[PDB]
Amino acid sequence: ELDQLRQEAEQLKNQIRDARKACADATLSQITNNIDPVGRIQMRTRRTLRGHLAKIYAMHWGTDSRLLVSASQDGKLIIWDSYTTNKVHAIPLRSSWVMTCAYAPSGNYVACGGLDNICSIYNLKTREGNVRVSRELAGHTGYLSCCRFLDDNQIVTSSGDTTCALWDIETGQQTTTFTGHTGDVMSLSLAPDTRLFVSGACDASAKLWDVREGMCRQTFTGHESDINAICFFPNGNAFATGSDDATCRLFDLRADQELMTYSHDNIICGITSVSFSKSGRLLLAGYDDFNCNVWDALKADRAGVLAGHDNRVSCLGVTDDGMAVATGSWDSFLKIWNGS
Amino acid sequence: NHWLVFSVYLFTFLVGLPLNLLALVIFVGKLRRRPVAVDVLLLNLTLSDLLLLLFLPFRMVEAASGMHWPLPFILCPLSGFLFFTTIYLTALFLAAVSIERFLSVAYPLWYKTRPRLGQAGLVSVACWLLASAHCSVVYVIEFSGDTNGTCYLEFREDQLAILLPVRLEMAVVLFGVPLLITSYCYSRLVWILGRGASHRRRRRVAGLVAATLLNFLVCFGPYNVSHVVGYIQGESPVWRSYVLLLSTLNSCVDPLVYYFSSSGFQADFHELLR
Amino acid sequence: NTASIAQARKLVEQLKMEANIDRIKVSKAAADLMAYCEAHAKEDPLLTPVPASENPF
Amino acid sequence: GCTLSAEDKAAVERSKMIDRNLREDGEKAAREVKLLLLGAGESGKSTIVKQMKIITGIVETHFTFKDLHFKMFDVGGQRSERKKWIHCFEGVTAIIFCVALSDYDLVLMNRMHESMKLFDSICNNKWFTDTSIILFLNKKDLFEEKIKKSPLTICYPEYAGSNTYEEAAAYIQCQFEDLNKRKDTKEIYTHFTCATDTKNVQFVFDAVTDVIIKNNLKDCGLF
Amino acid sequence: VQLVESGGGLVQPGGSRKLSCSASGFAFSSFGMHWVRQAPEKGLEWVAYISSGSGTIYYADTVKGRFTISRDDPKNTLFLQMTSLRSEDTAMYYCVRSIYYYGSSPFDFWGQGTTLTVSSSDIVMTQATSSVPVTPGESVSISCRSSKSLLHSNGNTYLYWFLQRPGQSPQLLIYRMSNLASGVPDRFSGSGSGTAFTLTISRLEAEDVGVYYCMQHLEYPLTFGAGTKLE
Ligand SMILES: CC1=C(C(=O)Nc2cc(Cl)ccc2Cl)[C@H](c2ccco2)C2=C(CCCC2=O)N1
């Protein structure tokens, strides 16, 4: 029957909770209370980036840390030159409803995918003057979210059908499928070292999956609702998670438990596109109250507010070198913020 | 005599300046996000209100000692021209915005398919030019009939015969024509809007239309009837005091209807105040 | 039924694989995070602003 | 003053050309009416799509009527959380909701009662607080033959009116309109469809014209 | 991608003739076009250029106000019309394509060329060596000099290196002296600083001899080098 299996699963959950609680003598706040505070931050934006007429999801800069890929609901993919405010490429989209931006480590490919259940790879370095579709991937029964770029040939994606898929660029066939989530899967930041990846589902669960083995190894449940934001703390031993309520949680990888949560009584709206910095001191969260916030990922306290936006901030990202931070909202405006 | 004028003039200036100073910010933002002809015509309606109100303290702070200008005779023509052209520009701007609102509903497909940004710009420039030329005709003759003289007061005999015909012509052209155009356009607006629609549409449209018609009448009715009756009487009427007070009240009431005229304006206003 | 048994067995197997994990103390992980974070503090423009002359905007 | 480095002159000129193409595409899309198609089950969605298209993602319809390009999106092929992708469709010209009149007896709570909560969630949605909704009462011909045998008392326990189509359809429309708690800012256009005198496309055109007039009024000041 | 030109022949001085460069295989409307002339025995000489959409049109000093150029995207072709010809205009004309964005490769592809005969503050770019013997297997360095520092206040130099085989159209080898052109073997390399550039060929093989040309892109107004011949 199934009653004994359910009882065994409950006992295993209790054992896992006991093991997690055993190694919880001290918290991050107690250790970090004896360090110098980050202090007030007055980061301001020096950019315009006015080329869109729809909601913006325009992150995943790239390794060169200057080019930008921008996807909106108008059905156009815009490649931005951040330094000079220039549009490099304007690729028409077959489907206007997309929520995905990727630039690939090589920079010669751009991934796009939304609720059309199609993932399109666009080749940038073509012998002609235009940008054409290099590979179309199908096999997902839900809206696409995140199109990370392991290599020039391997692309991992998440959809709303409670699964994740790794596809090959050369052959449009499935390679490795992860089926362990009970809800829609987004927030699939691709590690600092590309050998691993984690994904946050809609059932307040964040699960890590082996790229080669293709099996789940760790799960985290510390939220109370759907998760729509994941970073990976470029150190490689922790990752940040954001949910539809105004709270973020930092989960350690080796400890396998939530380290600390960042929340305030003055924030109630949602959270989208949580990303870290190149060192990890600053954690930037895109809230739904028409502005973004900066949190200290070490002690607890806030650091700054980025209020230079009109509509709800939907995407946020940082360059590889941490020179500047791109923020995009539904007001078809992209703001690039840099330190003083 | 001067108490009634200056007590209401200071109140109008003080209560008006912040209102349009604020309104210009949202108008500039609206032009920044997406452009539309009605917005640009309404913006031209507003910076005229600033130019009239910011130039108002030059003439307001005079104490009206004998209705004379202590300042030299070269500065009075500037104040007179600007103040007289700003008041008559409102009628043309209202006619233009009512014209646009007419095809906004009468031919919705025509309005949606074909944008009229350049047409609105050129017609606004044309209205500015027409109002400025009509105002220039009047004061280009007043300069000289040949504390030593007065401006916009009892004049000599030579220039009255030149003024009164063209003066009445200006009054008729810049009052009756906008009256007929705006009344016809808004009547067709409230007629077409009533063909198979809800009940709150008729309220929120016709009530505002009637209120604005009453406001336009209250502001520019006594002034124009005094203007007309001056032609039959022949001499300049002595009712020039309150007719300008109502004209100033017009420049102050417009923010109030600007606020609650459109729901989008209310939504934008309630959020950008920081 | 005959279909829920497979799902329950899969869940139990996944929990069994997750059960035996050589986790380490939370304090040690926090100390490692602090060490890495303070090691690269000087190289992070987010925390320490760069001079305007060398700022690429 | 920096001579723009020669090649960056051509780069910024290419940027201006891209901006020109972008604004041309935006102007073209601004004149395109977007309609969202929704339904509980079958709801006669296929019949409406097939009839009005000539007169696993989205089966987009780009039919034209009287120099107007209409966009129709069907999201019935997606089985996932609705609220995650429901904000992408905000700002549409109108939302088309189709409900079958012959669904007050069939189950899998009958189908129409299950459609009531979907209608409530769609009409009362925060993203759809300013978009007019066109309701279609499909299966009109089946209603005539399947109301005589099956009384209306099974579905509505508080109905005591005459067992006639002209009253039962009005009652169903009355409850469907009563599901709207934002009547002061939104309106519902209810229409009945049949395989004859196909005015459904004309009804959609009339509702689209009304909502365009509504929007232009907000853009042009009054209301 | 293919560029084929027509309109050559022998023309009396003072006549008018037009050259048609038809493009087949790429997006002509998104590519700026250049016309570059080569004398039968002298070096390569720039003629003119027209941007995408006919926005910016430039002519060289010897040809300014006399020549004309035009484009037509639907027909996918380039016309250059020539009036009041002289005996100095007898040259082989190349229609070439160039794109201008970040990380682009202008002058990547060249045309086939047309033979035209007539019977009867600019930056100078000099190469010290005009001809040097070469062997299949040694490394050879070619030095390029400029009258002005090509390093602008943006972080990149505007060098271009072109190879002309004995009987083939010139092809780009490196651009901006920091990136290798597509389809070019890794043996070639370039380096140097403003006013002094070098190009190193390591592990030289057969079927690569020819004439090397050195191009600057600081201003418009681009001047070739002397041309280094290897044999
Ligand atoms: C006095 C007046 C209006 C008007 O033009 N009224 C009117 C004038 C004539 Cl000559 C005939 C008939 C009428 Cl109803 C219109 C209006 C109409 C409805 C809402 O605002 C108007 C304002 C100021 C704000 C912008 C604006 O649009 N104030």
Nearby residues of E22 by Cβ (< 8 Å), 6 or more positions away: E3, E4, E5, E6, E76, E77, E78
Give the CATH H-level superfamily of domain C5-57: Transducin (heterotrimeric G protein), gamma chain (4.10.260.10)
What separation in Å is there between the alpha carbon of D27 and the centre of ligand 1? Answer: 30
Contacting residues for D12 by C-beta, under 8 A, at least 6 apart: A84, A86, D4
Q: Which mutation among B42, B193, B257 tests ligand 1's pocket best, with the greatest number of atoms within 8 A of CB?
A: B257
E180 vs A129: CA distance, rounded Å: 19
With CA atoms as reference, the chain D residue closest to B199 would be D184
Contacts of D210 in chain B (CB under 8 A): 197
| Token pair recorded at residue D93 | 């010209």
- Calculated CA dihedral for residues D102, D104, D105, D108, nearest 10 degrees: 100
> Could you give the count of Cα atoms lying within 13 Å of B129 in the half-sphere of its Cβ?
6
Q: How far apart are the first and last CA of chain B?
A: 44
Beta-carbon neighbour count of residue A154 at 10 Å?
17
**End-to-end alpha carbon distance in chain E:** 30
Q: Answer whether E102 sits within 8 Å of A125, measured CB to CB.
A: no
Q: How far is CA D95 from the centre of its chain?
A: 2
CB B41 within 8 A of CB B101: no
Q: Which domain holds residue B98?
A: 2-272
CA–CA gap between residue E22 and residue B106 (Å, rounded): 51
Residue D186 identity (one-letter amino acid): K
**Sign of the dihedral through C-alpha E146, E151, E157, E158:** negative
**Chain A touched by C3 (CB under 8 Å):** no
Helix axes B240-261, B37-60, angle to 10 degrees: 140
* Percent composition of chain D: helix, strand, coil (DSSP 3-state, to 5): 45, 15, 40
Instruction: Find out whether the beta carbon of D221 lies less than 6 Å from any atom of ligand 1.
Output: yes
Q: Please spell the DSSP secondary structure of B137-178, one letter per residue.
A: HHHHHHT-------SSSS--STTHHHHHHHHHHHHHHHHHHH
Q: How many Å apart are CA A162 and CA A179, to the nearest integer? A: 7
If phi over 0 gives left and psi between -120 and 50 gives alpha, with beta otherwise, what is residue A128? beta
Nearest CA in chain D to A201: D81
Please state at what angle helix D111-123 crosses helix D165-178, rounded to 10 degrees: 40
Distance B99 CA to ligand 1 centre (A): 11
Per-residue DSSP letter, D62? -
Question: Which residues numbered 67-106 in E keep a CB inside 8 Å of some CB on A?
Answer: 99, 101-103
Residue A198: partners with Cβ closer than 8 Å, 6 or more residues away? A188, A189, A191, A206, A207, A208, A209, A230, A232, A239
Structure tokens at B79: 């104040």
What is the end-to-end Cα distance of chain A in Å, rounded?
A: 65
CB atoms within 10 A of CB A123: 17
Spatial separation of the C-alpha atoms in residues D1 and D3, rounded to whole Å: 6
- Residue A113 near residue A157 (C-beta atoms within 8 A): yes
| Ligand 1 geometric centre to CA of B169 (Å) | 23
Question: Quick one: chain B helix, strand, coil %, rounded to 5?
Answer: 80, 0, 20
B178 lines ligand 1 (CB under 6 A): yes
Q: Which of E228, E96, E104, E212 is nearest to E158 (CA)?
A: E104
Question: Domain ranges in chain C?
Answer: 5-57
Q: Say how far apart CA D137 and CA A297 lie, in whole Å.
A: 55
CA distance D31 to chain E (A): 26
Verify whether ligand 1 is closer than 6 Å to residue B183 (CB atom): yes
Q: Which domain holds residue D19?
A: 4-223
Check pocket membership of D222 for ligand 1, CB cut-off 6 A: yes
Q: Which of E83, E209, E53, E75 is nearest to E140 (CA)?
A: E209
C1 CA: distance to closest CA in chain A (Å): 8
At E57, which amino acid appears? I
Contacts of A300 in chain C (CB under 8 A): none
- SS3 call for B211: helix
The reply to whether domains E3-118 and E125-223 share a CATH topology is yes
Does residue E50 belong to the interface with chain D, where contact is any CB pair within 8 Å? no
**In Å, how far are A91, A122, A150 from A131, measured between CA atoms?**
6, 6, 22
Distance CA A97, CA A94 (A): 9
Residue for token pair 């997902």: A140
Contact by Cβ (8 Å): B240, B233: no
Interface contact flag, D10 E153, Cβ < 8 Å: no
- D39, D97 in Cβ contact below 8 A? yes
A253 Cβ contact partners less than 8 Å away, ≥ 6 residues apart:
A208, A218, A236, A237, A238, A239, C29
Distance, first Cα to last Cα, chain D: 49
Looking up tokens 């504390």, which residue turns up? B147
Contact B93, B127 (CB under 8 A): yes
Task: Please work out whether the CB of residue B209 comes within 6 Å of at least one atom of ligand 1.
Answer: yes
How far is Cα D197 from Cα D185, in angstroms, rounded to an integer?
A: 32
What 3-state DSSP class applies to D52? helix
Nearest 5°: phi and psi at C55? -80, 120
Cβ atoms of residues A306 and A338 within 8 Å: no
Provide Rg for chain A, Cα atoms: 20
Tell which residue, A270, A249, A328, A263, has the closest CA to residue A302: A263
Asked whether E19 and E114 are in contact (CB, 8 A), the reply is yes
**Contact yes or no for D78 and A115 at CB 8 A:** yes
D56 DSSP 8-state letter: -
B11-38: burial string, b at 16+ Cβ within 10 Å, e else:
ebbeebbebbebbeebbeebeeeeebbb
C-alpha B203: how far from chain center: 26
Cβ–Cβ under 8 Å, residues D84 and D73: no
Strand partners, D59: none
Secondary structure string (H, E, C) spanning chain E: CCEEEECCEEECCCCCEEEEEEECCCCCCCCEEEEEEECCCCCEEEEEEECHHHCCEEECHHHCCCCEEEEECCCCEEEEEECCCCHHHCCEEEEEEECCCCCCCCCCEECCCEEEEECCCCCCEECCCCEECCCCCCCEEEEEEECCCCCCCCCCCCEEEEEECCCCCCEEEEECCCEECCCCCCCEEEEEECCEEEEEECCCCCCCCEEEEEEECCCCCCCCCCCEEEC
Q: Identify which of B24, B94, B99, B191 to mutate to test ligand 1's pocket (most ligand atoms within 8 A of the CB).
A: B94
CA B105 to chain centre: 25
Q: Please, are residues B137 and B155 in contact by the beta-carbon 8 Å criterion? A: no
- Chain centroid to CA E227: 12
Contacts of C among chains (3+ CB pairs under 8 A) = A
Residue of E229, E230, E141 whose CA lies nearest to E192: E141
Buried-exposed string D73-93: b where 16+ CB fall within 10 A, e elsewhere: bbbbebebeeebbbbbbbebb
3-state SS class at D188: strand
| DSSP state letters, D78-146 | --S-HHHHSSTTTT-SEEEEEEETT-SS-B--BHHHHHHHHHHHHHT-STTSS--EEEEEE-HHHHHHH
Q: Considering Cα of B192, then B195, then B198, then B200, what sign does the dihedral take?
A: positive
Residue A281: φ, ψ to 5°: -60, -40
- What letter would DSSP give residue C40? T
Name residues whose C-beta falls within 8 Å of residue A73's C-beta, 6 or more positions apart in sequence. Answer: A54, A55, A96, A97, A98, D88
Does residue B163 have its Cβ closer than 6 Å to ligand 1? no
Flag whether D touches A (3+ CB pairs, 8 A cutoff): yes
Q: Alpha-carbon distance A156 to A143, whole Å?
A: 14
The two three-digit tokens of residue E128, written as one number: 């010290």
Pick from E165, E171, E15: which is nearest to E90 by CA?
Answer: E15
Note whether A216 and A196 are within 8 A (CB).
no
Q: Is D141 annotated as contributing to ligand binding?
A: yes
Cα D89 to Cα B127, D45, D82: the distances in Å are: 42, 19, 11
- Contact between A321 and A58 under an 8 Å Cβ cutoff? The reply is no
- The conformation of residue C49, written as its DSSP 8-state character, comes to P
d(CA B79, CA B59): 7
Q: Residue D73 carries which DSSP code? A: E
Looking at residue C36, its amino acid is: Y
- Is E155 an interface residue toward D (CB < 8 Å)? no
Q: What is the DSSP letter of D36?
A: E
Q: Determine the length of chain C.
A: 57
Cβ–Cβ < 8 Å for E215, E165 = no
- Ligand 1 mean position to B205 CA, how many Å? 11
Answer yes or no: are the C-beta atoms of B79 and B51 closer than 8 Å: no
**Total domain count for chain D?**
1
Q: How far is the CA of B15 from the centre of ligand 1 (A)?
A: 21
How many C-beta atoms surround the C-beta of residue A101 within 10 A?
27
Q: Report the SS3 class of residue D51.
A: helix
| Element housing D170 (H / E) | helix D165-178
A116 and A97 in contact (C-beta within 8 Å)?
A: yes
H or E stretch covering B136: helix B117-142
**Nearest by Cα to E50 from E23, E27, E71:** E71
What topology does CATH give the domain E125-223?
A: Immunoglobulin-like (2.60.40)
SS3 label, residue D54: coil
Residue type, D189: Y
3-state DSSP of A72-94: ECCCEEEEEECCCCEEEEEEECC
Alpha carbon distance D85, A145 (integer Å)? 11
Q: Name B217's Cβ contacts closer than 8 Å, sequence gap at least 6.
A: none
* Nearest in space to E71 (alpha carbons), one of E82, E63, E62, E81: E81
The alpha carbon of residue E59 is apart from the nearest alpha carbon of chain D, in Å, by 15
Contacts for D116-123: CB closer than 8 Å, 24+ residues apart: D116/D175, D116/D176, D116/D179, D118/D38, D118/D40, D119/D176, D119/D179, D120/D179, D121/D82, D122/D38, D122/D95, D122/D97, D123/D179, D123/D180, D123/D181, D123/D182, D123/D186, D123/D188
**Could you say which of E100, E152, E153 has the minimum Cβ distance to residue D10?**
E100
Six-digit token pair at A275? 């990303």
Looking up residue B236, the CATH number of its domain turns out to be 1.20.1070.10
**Taking CB atoms and an 8 Å limit, are A279 and C5 in contact across chains?**
no
E72 strand-pairing partners: E77
Q: Which residues of B touch D132 (CB under 8 A)?
A: none
Sheet with E228-230, edge to edge strand ranges: E131-132, E228-230, E210-216, E159-164, E171-175, E179-180
* Distance from C-alpha of C3 to C-alpha of C7, rounded to nearest angstrom: 7
Class of domain E3-118: mainly beta
Q: Which fold has domain A2-337?
A: Methylamine Dehydrogenase; Chain H (2.130.10)
Size of interface A-D (CB pairs under 8 A): 76
Chain D residue numbers touching B263 (CB-CB < 8 A)? 218, 223
D120 annotated as ligand-binding? no
Q: What one-letter code names the amino acid at E172?
A: L
Resolution in Å, one decimal, please: 3.2
Quick one: three-class SS letters along B29-64? HHHHHCCCHHHHHHHHHHHHHHHHHHHHHHHHCCCC
d(CA A308, CA A327): 9
Q: Are A206 and A191 in contact (CB under 8 A)?
A: no
Cα separation of D188 and A126, whole Å? Answer: 51
Q: Domain ranges in chain A?
A: 2-337
Q: Which two tokens stand for residue D173?
A: 């429309």
Three-state secondary-structure class, residue B21: helix
How many CB contacts within 8 angstroms connect chain D with chain E? 36
Cβ partners under 8 Å of residue A70, min gap 6? A51, A52, A56, A57, A58, A77, A78, A79, A80, A101, A328, A334
- With contact defined as beta carbons under 8 Å apart, do E225 and E125 qualify? yes
CATH classification at residue D162: 3.40.50.300
Three-state SS at A139: coil
CB-based contacts of A159, cutoff 8 Å, min separation 6: A117, A140, A141, A142, A143, A144, A145, A165, A184, A185
Neighbours of chain D (3+ CB pairs under 8 A): A, B, E
Cβ pair D212:B261 closer than 8 A = no
CA distance readout (Å), B183 to A310, B179, B210, E22: 38, 6, 10, 62
Say whether A90 and D22 touch across the interface (CB within 8 A). Answer: yes
What is d(CA A297, CA A56) in angstroms, rounded to the nearest whole number?
A: 26
Contact between A88 and E1 using a beta-carbon 8 Å cutoff:
no
Give the 3-state secondary structure of A29-41: HHHHCCCCCCCCC
Q: Are C42 and C48 in contact (CB under 8 A)?
A: yes
Ligand 1 mutation target, pool B48, B172, B181, B216, most atoms within 8 A of CB: B216
Of ligand 1's listed atoms, the one at least distance from the Cα of B209 is 14
E27 → chain A, closest CA residue: A129
CB of B94 closer than 6 A to ligand 1?
A: yes
The whole-angstrom separation of Cα E49 and Cα E171 is 18
Cα distance between residue A286 and residue C6, in whole Å: 40
Output the DSSP codes for A2-63: -HHHHHHHHHHHHHHHHHHHHT-SS-HHHHHTTS--------EE-------SS-B------T
